[PDB]
Amino acid sequence: IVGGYTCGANTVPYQVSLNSGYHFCGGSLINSQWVVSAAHCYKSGIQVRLGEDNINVVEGNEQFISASKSIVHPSYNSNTLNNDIMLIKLKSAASLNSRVASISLPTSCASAGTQCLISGWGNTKSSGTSYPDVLKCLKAPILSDSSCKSAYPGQITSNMFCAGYLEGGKDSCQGDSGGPVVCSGKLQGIVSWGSGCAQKNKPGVYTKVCNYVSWIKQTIASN
Ligand SMILES: NC(=[NH2+])c1ccc2[nH]c(-c3ccccc3O)nc2c1
Numbered sequence: 001i002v003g004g005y006t007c008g009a010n011t012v013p014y015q016v017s018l019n020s021g022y023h024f025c026g027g028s029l030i031n032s033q034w035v036v037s038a039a040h041c042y043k044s045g046i047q048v049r050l051g052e053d054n055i056n057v058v059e060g061n062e063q064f065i066s067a068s069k070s071i072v073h074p075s076y077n078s079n080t081l082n083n084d085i086m087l088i089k090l091k092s093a094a095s096l097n098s099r100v101a102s103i104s105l106p107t108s109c110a111s112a113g114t115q116c117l118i119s120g121w122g123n124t125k126s127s128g129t130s131y132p133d134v135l136k137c138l139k140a141p142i143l144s145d146s147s148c149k150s151a152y153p154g155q156i157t158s159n160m161f162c163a164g165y166l167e168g169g170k171d172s173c174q175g176d177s178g179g180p181v182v183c184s185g186k187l188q189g190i191v192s193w194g195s196g197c198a199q200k201n202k203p204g205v206y207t208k209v210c211n212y213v214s215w216i217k218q219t220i221a222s223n
């Protein structure tokens with residue numbers, strides 16, 4: 001996260017870190033046995049880390065659980081990143097409490113102007129790599145479809161939305177992929193891609209979760 005602030009330990013209880021010997025992506029806890037992240041974060045050997053704040057120190061509240069299965073959306077396209085969503089079932093259920101809690105799925109899509117909270121342990125520099133130890137937060141508004149499509153002509157599908165600042169300086173960045181974009185207490189987006197990080201006129205692009213709620217529900221129901 002570039003231009004963001006330190007969230008404060010466990011203030012984002014649904015945030016998870018996907019770890020394979022190092023933190024590589026973020027994710028969101030939606031129930032005690034399922035996490036939602038981005039299909040481009042897929043790999044085998046994933047350990048899900050819940051209740052985390054400093055990812056390099058065990059400080060208490062952490063729950064490390066291995067992934068039992070990862071379900072990438074069947075229509076995920078790695079060249080366009082369309083349908084960039086994945087579900088991870090945990091080997092055992094997490095113990096939910098005030099530090100580890102699930103986030104609700106939306107009932108409607110959000111409108112441009114809606115303010116959302118984006119969080120993650122990704123890069124905090126737009127030029128160079130500086131990964132933080134603790135969770136960073138950023139408040140960003142959803143942008144109108146015309147500004148999004150004017151910024152990335154031909155690259156935005158109806159399963160994507162832009163959020164951020166066209167003047168530059170604040171954005172999600174590498175290491176944040178798969179994490180949450182929460183607006184009014186509902187999971188509306190998943191960190192998916194962007195051109196560089198925090199560059200002027202190049203906002204972040206996110207998976208539009210409201211288009212997948214029925215798939216998420218049907219898939220969890222059958223697995
Ligand atoms: N500017 C952004 N809003 C952004 C967000 C997530 C990203 N994730 C990545 C990324 C880069 C290399 C490998 C995996 C990634 O998810 N770049 C990213 C850029």
Ligand SMILES: [Ca+2]
Nearest residue numbers: 054057058059
């Ligand atoms: Ca820790």
